[PDB]
Amino acid sequence: IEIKDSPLPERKLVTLIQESYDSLKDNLSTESTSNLLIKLVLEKLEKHSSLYKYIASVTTLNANFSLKNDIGASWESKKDGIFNYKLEDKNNNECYLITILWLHK
Amino acid sequence: IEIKDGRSDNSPLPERKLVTLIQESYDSLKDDNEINLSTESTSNLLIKLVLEKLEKHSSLYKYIASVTTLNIEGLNEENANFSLKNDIGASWESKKDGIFNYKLEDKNNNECYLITILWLHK
């Protein structure tokens, strides 16, 4: 058991996520922002490297609040890792916490 | 790309036993008789307890446990109107991999937890 603390440098991971988001908040379905963000991010990570499997998890929150995430795995691997990123939409009153988890093949 | 279905019957154990596994782990941390001499947060202790109990039930799966902690400052949390949801997607499709979501509230500490369990078939 290991609490987790990459295939891409972190700065690219930020760009990857922030662009997917801005491209949504810039739709005739009822798909949510969070579900659309998840699909975008997984597409683009898949294009970069096939050496990993990817999980993208998004908590949506709709004042003084803090939003944190923790993640543990039942196995240990220095090649598996996570990245957390927070996104806000001050006008629609919504906060997004996205976590990327990569599983080395 | 597959959005994982939170209400699908995939788990190595029935949902009822998943709820119990999680609630009891949580109750074991909030019990007034418990002493934590480490600096590990409730969320991180919950994750360790839940993964332990999942490993004992079935070794045929790898498990991931993710906890979001909402902490509200400046008003009592039961007087606030908010929603706290989670969605999860994976880069591959396994009919045997699945997820389960569960919400725990601590009204007295102005805290809400959203726990997600992911099982990956080996």
* φ and ψ of B39, to 5 deg: -95, 15
**Domain ranges (residues) in chain A:** 1-105
Elucidation technique:
X-ray
The 3 state secondary structure assigned to chain B is CEECCCCCCCCCCCHHHHHHHHHHHHHHHHCCCCCCCCCCCHHHHHHHHHHHHHHHHCCCEEEEEEEEEEEEECCCHHHCCCCEEEEEEECCCCCCCEEEEEEEEEHHHCEEEEEEEEEEEC
- Return d(Cα A70, Cα A72) in angstroms, integer: 7
Report how many Cβ contacts below 8 Å link chain A to chain B.
127
B3 beta partners:
B89
Q: Resolution in A for the shown PDB structure?
A: 2.3
Q: Does B48 sit within 8 Å of A3, measured CB to CB?
A: yes
> Residue A90: what are its φ and ψ, rounded to 5°?
-60, -20
Phi, then psi, of B94 in degrees rounded to 5: -130, 125
Give the phi and the psi of residue A56 in degrees, each rounded to 5: -125, 125
Residue A84 parent element (H or E): strand A81-89
For chain B, the residues whose C-beta falls within 8 A of a C-beta of chain A are 1, 3, 41, 43-44, 47-48, 51-52, 54-55, 62-75, 80, 82-92, 114, 116, 118, 120
